[PDB]
Amino acid sequence: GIVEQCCTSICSLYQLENYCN
Amino acid sequence: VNQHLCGSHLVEALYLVCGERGFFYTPK
Ligand SMILES: [Cl-]
Ligand SMILES: [Zn+2]
């Protein structure tokens, strides 16, 4: 998930917007 | 790579990025 994707490697604001509601 | 320490940074960044739309945080 986002832990998998954003903790090993740095997610941008762009990538993180994907998890919004 | 501590998901727990990392997780708390992520919930804070999702609060800024998502703002008003909100989000679900399932640690999943
Ligand atoms: Cl930390
Ligand atoms: Zn920290």
Side-chain angles (χ1 to χ4, degrees):
Chain A
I2 184 180
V3 161
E4 210 221 320
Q5 162 168 324
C6 300
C7 291
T8 102
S9 315
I10 297 135
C11 295
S12 77
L13 178 167
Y14 300 113
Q15 271 151 314
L16 288 163
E17 221 164 33
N18 310 332
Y19 308 105
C20 304
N21 255 181
Chain B
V1 46
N2 189 337
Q3 78 130 228
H4 186 58
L5 290 203
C6 178
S8 101
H9 285 290
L10 295 177
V11 298
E12 197 159 320
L14 285 184
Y15 155 88
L16 297 154
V17 168
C18 305
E20 336 288 312
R21 267 140 92 201
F23 62 102
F24 283 69
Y25 183 92
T26 354
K28 222 102 191 133

Short mmCIF file of all heavy atoms in Angstrom, two decimals:
data_model
loop_
_atom_site.label_atom_id
_atom_site.label_comp_id
_atom_site.label_asym_id
_atom_site.label_seq_id
_atom_site.Cartn_x
_atom_site.Cartn_y
_atom_site.Cartn_z
N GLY A 1 0.81 -1.26 0.00
CA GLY A 1 0.00 0.00 0.00
C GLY A 1 0.82 1.28 0.00
O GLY A 1 1.86 1.38 -0.65
N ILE A 2 0.39 2.30 0.73
CA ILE A 2 1.08 3.58 0.85
C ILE A 2 2.27 3.48 1.79
O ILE A 2 3.28 4.18 1.66
CB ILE A 2 0.11 4.68 1.31
CG1 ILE A 2 0.79 6.05 1.34
CG2 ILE A 2 -0.50 4.22 2.65
CD1 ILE A 2 -0.13 7.17 1.80
N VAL A 3 2.16 2.55 2.75
CA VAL A 3 3.29 2.31 3.65
C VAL A 3 4.40 1.70 2.80
O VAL A 3 5.55 2.14 2.76
CB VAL A 3 2.86 1.45 4.84
CG1 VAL A 3 4.06 0.82 5.54
CG2 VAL A 3 2.08 2.32 5.82
N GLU A 4 4.03 0.69 2.02
CA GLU A 4 4.94 0.01 1.10
C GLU A 4 5.62 0.93 0.09
O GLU A 4 6.83 1.00 -0.12
CB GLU A 4 4.04 -1.02 0.42
CG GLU A 4 4.62 -2.33 -0.07
CD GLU A 4 4.01 -2.68 -1.43
OE1 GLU A 4 2.78 -2.44 -1.57
OE2 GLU A 4 4.79 -3.14 -2.30
N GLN A 5 4.80 1.73 -0.60
CA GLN A 5 5.17 2.69 -1.60
C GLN A 5 5.84 3.95 -1.07
O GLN A 5 6.86 4.34 -1.68
CB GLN A 5 3.87 3.05 -2.38
CG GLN A 5 3.98 4.33 -3.17
CD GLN A 5 2.90 4.65 -4.17
OE1 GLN A 5 2.41 3.70 -4.78
NE2 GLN A 5 2.51 5.92 -4.37
N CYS A 6 5.30 4.56 -0.01
CA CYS A 6 5.88 5.81 0.52
C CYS A 6 6.86 5.77 1.67
O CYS A 6 7.45 6.80 2.05
CB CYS A 6 4.69 6.75 0.86
SG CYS A 6 3.64 7.13 -0.59
N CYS A 7 7.18 4.61 2.24
CA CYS A 7 8.15 4.52 3.33
C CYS A 7 9.52 4.06 2.84
O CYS A 7 10.54 4.55 3.38
CB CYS A 7 7.67 3.63 4.49
SG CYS A 7 6.27 4.35 5.40
N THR A 8 9.59 3.18 1.83
CA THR A 8 10.91 2.76 1.31
C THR A 8 11.55 3.91 0.51
O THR A 8 12.72 4.29 0.57
CB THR A 8 10.89 1.52 0.40
OG1 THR A 8 10.98 1.87 -0.99
CG2 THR A 8 9.61 0.69 0.61
N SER A 9 10.64 4.46 -0.31
CA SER A 9 10.94 5.59 -1.18
C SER A 9 9.89 6.71 -1.01
O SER A 9 8.69 6.58 -0.82
CB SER A 9 11.10 5.20 -2.65
OG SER A 9 11.89 4.03 -2.86
N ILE A 10 10.41 7.91 -1.11
CA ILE A 10 9.76 9.19 -1.03
C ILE A 10 8.73 9.47 -2.10
O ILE A 10 9.06 9.57 -3.29
CB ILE A 10 10.88 10.27 -1.14
CG1 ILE A 10 11.82 10.10 0.06
CG2 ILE A 10 10.33 11.66 -1.22
CD1 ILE A 10 13.30 10.14 -0.27
N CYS A 11 7.50 9.63 -1.67
CA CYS A 11 6.38 9.99 -2.48
C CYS A 11 6.30 11.52 -2.47
O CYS A 11 6.53 12.22 -1.46
CB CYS A 11 5.04 9.49 -1.95
SG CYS A 11 5.02 7.70 -2.00
N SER A 12 5.97 12.04 -3.63
CA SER A 12 5.79 13.47 -3.88
C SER A 12 4.37 13.80 -3.49
O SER A 12 3.59 12.90 -3.16
CB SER A 12 6.02 13.74 -5.37
OG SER A 12 4.94 13.37 -6.23
N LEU A 13 3.95 15.03 -3.55
CA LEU A 13 2.60 15.54 -3.26
C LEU A 13 1.64 14.94 -4.29
O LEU A 13 0.50 14.62 -4.00
CB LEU A 13 2.78 17.05 -3.28
CG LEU A 13 1.71 18.09 -3.08
CD1 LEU A 13 2.32 19.48 -2.87
CD2 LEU A 13 0.78 18.15 -4.29
N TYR A 14 2.17 14.80 -5.52
CA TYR A 14 1.51 14.23 -6.67
C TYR A 14 1.09 12.78 -6.44
O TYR A 14 -0.06 12.44 -6.69
CB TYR A 14 2.41 14.38 -7.95
CG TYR A 14 2.59 15.89 -8.08
CD1 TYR A 14 3.82 16.46 -7.89
CD2 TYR A 14 1.48 16.71 -8.27
CE1 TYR A 14 3.99 17.83 -7.93
CE2 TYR A 14 1.59 18.08 -8.34
CZ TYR A 14 2.86 18.60 -8.16
OH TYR A 14 3.09 19.96 -8.19
N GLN A 15 2.01 11.97 -5.93
CA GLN A 15 1.78 10.57 -5.62
C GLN A 15 0.84 10.40 -4.43
O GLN A 15 0.01 9.51 -4.39
CB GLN A 15 3.08 9.83 -5.27
CG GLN A 15 3.85 9.20 -6.40
CD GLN A 15 5.34 9.10 -6.20
OE1 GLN A 15 6.00 10.04 -5.78
NE2 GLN A 15 6.07 8.02 -6.45
N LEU A 16 0.99 11.26 -3.43
CA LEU A 16 0.23 11.26 -2.20
C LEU A 16 -1.21 11.69 -2.45
O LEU A 16 -2.09 11.20 -1.74
CB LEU A 16 0.81 12.16 -1.09
CG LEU A 16 2.11 11.59 -0.46
CD1 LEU A 16 2.82 12.69 0.31
CD2 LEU A 16 1.77 10.33 0.34
N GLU A 17 -1.55 12.48 -3.43
CA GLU A 17 -2.90 12.90 -3.75
C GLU A 17 -3.83 11.77 -4.14
O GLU A 17 -5.02 11.97 -4.09
CB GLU A 17 -2.81 13.81 -4.97
CG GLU A 17 -3.68 15.04 -4.99
CD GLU A 17 -3.13 15.98 -6.07
OE1 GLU A 17 -2.61 15.54 -7.13
OE2 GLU A 17 -3.26 17.20 -5.80
N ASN A 18 -3.26 10.65 -4.54
CA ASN A 18 -3.80 9.40 -4.98
C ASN A 18 -4.57 8.77 -3.81
O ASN A 18 -5.60 8.12 -4.09
CB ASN A 18 -2.81 8.37 -5.54
CG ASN A 18 -1.78 8.69 -6.60
OD1 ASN A 18 -1.84 9.56 -7.49
ND2 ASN A 18 -0.63 7.98 -6.63
N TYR A 19 -4.15 9.00 -2.55
CA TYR A 19 -4.76 8.46 -1.34
C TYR A 19 -5.84 9.33 -0.72
O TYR A 19 -6.55 8.93 0.23
CB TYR A 19 -3.64 8.13 -0.32
CG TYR A 19 -2.59 7.26 -0.96
CD1 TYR A 19 -1.34 7.77 -1.34
CD2 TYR A 19 -2.82 5.93 -1.24
CE1 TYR A 19 -0.34 7.01 -1.93
CE2 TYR A 19 -1.86 5.13 -1.84
CZ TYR A 19 -0.63 5.69 -2.16
OH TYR A 19 0.28 4.82 -2.73
N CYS A 20 -6.04 10.52 -1.31
CA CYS A 20 -7.11 11.41 -0.83
C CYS A 20 -8.49 10.79 -1.15
O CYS A 20 -8.69 9.80 -1.87
CB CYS A 20 -6.93 12.83 -1.38
SG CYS A 20 -5.29 13.50 -0.93
N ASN A 21 -9.49 11.41 -0.55
CA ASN A 21 -10.89 11.00 -0.64
C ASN A 21 -11.67 11.48 -1.85
O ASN A 21 -12.32 10.59 -2.45
CB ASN A 21 -11.70 11.49 0.60
CG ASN A 21 -11.97 10.31 1.52
OD1 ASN A 21 -12.63 10.44 2.57
ND2 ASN A 21 -11.48 9.14 1.11
N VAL B 1 13.29 2.36 8.09
CA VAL B 1 12.06 1.64 7.58
C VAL B 1 11.33 1.16 8.84
O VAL B 1 11.31 -0.02 9.23
CB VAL B 1 12.60 0.42 6.79
CG1 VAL B 1 13.70 -0.28 7.60
CG2 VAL B 1 11.48 -0.55 6.41
N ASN B 2 10.73 2.11 9.56
CA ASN B 2 9.90 1.80 10.74
C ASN B 2 8.60 2.45 10.19
O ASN B 2 8.59 3.65 9.95
CB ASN B 2 10.25 2.26 12.13
CG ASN B 2 9.46 1.74 13.32
OD1 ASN B 2 8.31 1.29 13.21
ND2 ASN B 2 9.97 1.76 14.55
N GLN B 3 7.64 1.59 9.94
CA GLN B 3 6.35 1.94 9.38
C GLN B 3 5.49 2.80 10.31
O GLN B 3 4.62 3.59 9.94
CB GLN B 3 5.57 0.64 9.05
CG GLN B 3 4.92 -0.06 10.24
CD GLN B 3 3.46 -0.44 10.08
OE1 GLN B 3 2.60 -0.19 10.96
NE2 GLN B 3 3.14 -1.07 8.94
N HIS B 4 5.78 2.56 11.58
CA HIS B 4 5.10 3.22 12.67
C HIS B 4 5.58 4.66 12.78
O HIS B 4 4.78 5.60 12.80
CB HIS B 4 5.33 2.37 13.93
CG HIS B 4 4.51 2.98 15.03
ND1 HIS B 4 3.13 3.10 14.85
CD2 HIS B 4 4.82 3.51 16.23
CE1 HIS B 4 2.64 3.69 15.93
NE2 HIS B 4 3.62 3.94 16.78
N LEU B 5 6.89 4.86 12.79
CA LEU B 5 7.43 6.22 12.82
C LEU B 5 7.12 6.88 11.48
O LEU B 5 6.76 8.05 11.34
CB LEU B 5 8.91 6.09 13.13
CG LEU B 5 9.42 5.67 14.50
CD1 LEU B 5 10.85 6.15 14.72
CD2 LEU B 5 8.54 6.17 15.65
N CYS B 6 7.28 6.14 10.38
CA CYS B 6 6.98 6.59 9.02
C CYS B 6 5.49 6.92 8.87
O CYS B 6 5.12 8.04 8.43
CB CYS B 6 7.44 5.54 8.01
SG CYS B 6 7.02 6.02 6.32
N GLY B 7 4.59 6.02 9.27
CA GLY B 7 3.16 6.20 9.28
C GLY B 7 2.77 7.54 9.86
O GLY B 7 1.94 8.30 9.28
N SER B 8 3.34 7.96 11.00
CA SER B 8 2.93 9.25 11.61
C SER B 8 3.28 10.46 10.76
O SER B 8 2.59 11.51 10.74
CB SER B 8 3.41 9.21 13.06
OG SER B 8 4.59 9.93 13.29
N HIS B 9 4.35 10.33 9.94
CA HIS B 9 4.73 11.36 8.98
C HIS B 9 3.77 11.40 7.79
O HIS B 9 3.40 12.46 7.26
CB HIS B 9 6.13 11.03 8.47
CG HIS B 9 7.11 11.38 9.54
ND1 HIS B 9 7.34 12.72 9.83
CD2 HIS B 9 7.95 10.70 10.31
CE1 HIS B 9 8.28 12.84 10.76
NE2 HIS B 9 8.66 11.64 11.06
N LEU B 10 3.32 10.22 7.35
CA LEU B 10 2.40 10.04 6.25
C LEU B 10 1.02 10.59 6.61
O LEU B 10 0.43 11.32 5.79
CB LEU B 10 2.23 8.58 5.86
CG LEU B 10 3.41 7.80 5.29
CD1 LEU B 10 3.02 6.33 5.04
CD2 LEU B 10 3.95 8.51 4.05
N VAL B 11 0.46 10.32 7.81
CA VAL B 11 -0.87 10.85 8.18
C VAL B 11 -0.86 12.38 8.25
O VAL B 11 -1.83 13.12 8.00
CB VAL B 11 -1.47 10.23 9.46
CG1 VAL B 11 -1.69 8.71 9.26
CG2 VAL B 11 -0.74 10.44 10.79
N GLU B 12 0.30 12.91 8.60
CA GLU B 12 0.45 14.35 8.66
C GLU B 12 0.52 14.99 7.28
O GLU B 12 -0.07 16.04 7.06
CB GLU B 12 1.70 14.59 9.48
CG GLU B 12 1.77 16.01 10.00
CD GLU B 12 2.74 16.01 11.20
OE1 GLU B 12 2.61 14.99 11.94
OE2 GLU B 12 3.53 16.99 11.26
N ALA B 13 1.20 14.37 6.32
CA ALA B 13 1.35 14.81 4.94
C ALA B 13 0.05 14.63 4.16
O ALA B 13 -0.24 15.47 3.31
CB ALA B 13 2.47 14.07 4.23
N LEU B 14 -0.73 13.57 4.46
CA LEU B 14 -2.04 13.35 3.85
C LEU B 14 -3.03 14.39 4.37
O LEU B 14 -3.91 14.91 3.66
CB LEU B 14 -2.60 11.94 4.09
CG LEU B 14 -1.89 10.89 3.19
CD1 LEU B 14 -2.51 9.53 3.35
CD2 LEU B 14 -1.85 11.40 1.74
N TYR B 15 -2.90 14.78 5.65
CA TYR B 15 -3.76 15.87 6.14
C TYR B 15 -3.45 17.16 5.35
O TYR B 15 -4.31 18.00 5.04
CB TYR B 15 -3.58 15.95 7.69
CG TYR B 15 -3.93 17.37 8.09
CD1 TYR B 15 -5.23 17.74 8.40
CD2 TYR B 15 -2.95 18.36 8.10
CE1 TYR B 15 -5.58 19.05 8.72
CE2 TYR B 15 -3.28 19.67 8.42
CZ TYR B 15 -4.59 20.01 8.71
OH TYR B 15 -4.85 21.33 9.01
N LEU B 16 -2.22 17.51 4.95
CA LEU B 16 -1.91 18.74 4.22
C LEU B 16 -2.29 18.72 2.72
O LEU B 16 -2.84 19.65 2.16
CB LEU B 16 -0.42 19.18 4.29
CG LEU B 16 0.20 19.54 5.65
CD1 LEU B 16 1.71 19.30 5.62
CD2 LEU B 16 -0.21 20.94 6.01
N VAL B 17 -2.05 17.61 2.08
CA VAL B 17 -2.26 17.34 0.67
C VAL B 17 -3.74 17.19 0.36
O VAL B 17 -4.30 17.80 -0.56
CB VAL B 17 -1.36 16.14 0.28
CG1 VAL B 17 -1.71 15.57 -1.09
CG2 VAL B 17 0.12 16.49 0.27
N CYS B 18 -4.43 16.41 1.19
CA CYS B 18 -5.85 16.16 1.00
C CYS B 18 -6.67 17.31 1.49
O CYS B 18 -7.70 17.59 0.87
CB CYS B 18 -6.29 14.83 1.66
SG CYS B 18 -5.30 13.43 1.10
N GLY B 19 -6.24 17.97 2.54
CA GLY B 19 -6.97 19.11 3.07
C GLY B 19 -8.38 18.64 3.42
O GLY B 19 -8.76 17.67 4.06
N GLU B 20 -9.32 19.35 2.90
CA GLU B 20 -10.76 19.41 2.91
C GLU B 20 -11.41 18.13 2.39
O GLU B 20 -12.43 17.71 2.96
CB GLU B 20 -10.98 20.73 2.13
CG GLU B 20 -9.84 21.78 2.12
CD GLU B 20 -9.55 22.56 3.39
OE1 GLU B 20 -10.44 23.12 4.08
OE2 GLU B 20 -8.36 22.62 3.78
N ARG B 21 -10.88 17.40 1.41
CA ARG B 21 -11.39 16.15 0.91
C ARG B 21 -11.31 14.96 1.86
O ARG B 21 -12.01 13.96 1.75
CB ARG B 21 -10.52 15.69 -0.28
CG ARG B 21 -10.97 16.09 -1.65
CD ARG B 21 -9.74 16.47 -2.46
NE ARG B 21 -9.06 15.48 -3.27
CZ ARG B 21 -7.79 15.49 -3.73
NH1 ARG B 21 -6.83 16.41 -3.54
NH2 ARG B 21 -7.47 14.41 -4.46
N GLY B 22 -10.37 14.99 2.80
CA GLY B 22 -10.09 14.00 3.79
C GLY B 22 -9.46 12.77 3.18
O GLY B 22 -9.17 12.76 2.02
N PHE B 23 -9.28 11.73 3.97
CA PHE B 23 -8.69 10.46 3.63
C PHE B 23 -9.01 9.39 4.69
O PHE B 23 -9.45 9.62 5.81
CB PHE B 23 -7.13 10.58 3.50
CG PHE B 23 -6.42 10.98 4.77
CD1 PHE B 23 -5.76 10.04 5.54
CD2 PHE B 23 -6.40 12.30 5.21
CE1 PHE B 23 -5.13 10.41 6.73
CE2 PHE B 23 -5.77 12.68 6.38
CZ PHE B 23 -5.12 11.73 7.16
N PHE B 24 -8.78 8.15 4.34
CA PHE B 24 -8.88 6.98 5.13
C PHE B 24 -7.45 6.48 5.33
O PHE B 24 -6.73 6.40 4.34
CB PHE B 24 -9.69 5.87 4.45
CG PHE B 24 -11.18 6.11 4.52
CD1 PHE B 24 -11.71 7.17 3.78
CD2 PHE B 24 -12.02 5.35 5.30
CE1 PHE B 24 -13.05 7.50 3.79
CE2 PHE B 24 -13.37 5.68 5.32
CZ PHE B 24 -13.88 6.74 4.58
N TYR B 25 -7.06 6.17 6.56
CA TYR B 25 -5.73 5.66 6.80
C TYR B 25 -5.96 4.25 7.42
O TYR B 25 -6.36 4.12 8.55
CB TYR B 25 -4.77 6.41 7.71
CG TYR B 25 -3.38 5.82 7.84
CD1 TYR B 25 -2.38 6.26 6.98
CD2 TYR B 25 -3.02 4.88 8.81
CE1 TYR B 25 -1.06 5.79 7.03
CE2 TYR B 25 -1.73 4.40 8.87
CZ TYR B 25 -0.75 4.84 7.99
OH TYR B 25 0.55 4.39 8.01
N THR B 26 -5.61 3.29 6.59
CA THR B 26 -5.70 1.87 6.92
C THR B 26 -4.27 1.31 6.80
O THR B 26 -3.65 1.14 5.75
CB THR B 26 -6.79 1.18 6.09
OG1 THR B 26 -7.54 2.14 5.30
CG2 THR B 26 -7.81 0.44 6.98
N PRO B 27 -3.69 1.07 7.98
CA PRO B 27 -2.38 0.55 8.25
C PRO B 27 -2.30 -0.99 8.26
O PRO B 27 -2.97 -1.63 9.11
CB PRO B 27 -1.98 1.05 9.65
CG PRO B 27 -3.25 1.59 10.22
CD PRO B 27 -4.39 1.28 9.27
N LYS B 28 -2.00 -1.55 7.08
CA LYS B 28 -3.25 -2.44 5.19
C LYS B 28 -2.75 -1.86 3.83
O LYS B 28 -2.55 -0.62 3.73
CB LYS B 28 -4.83 -2.74 5.00
CG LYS B 28 -5.18 -4.06 4.28
CD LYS B 28 -5.61 -5.14 5.27
CE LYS B 28 -5.71 -6.54 4.68
NZ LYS B 28 -5.05 -7.56 5.50
CL CL C 1 11.21 9.29 12.15
ZN ZN C 2 9.86 11.01 12.67
#
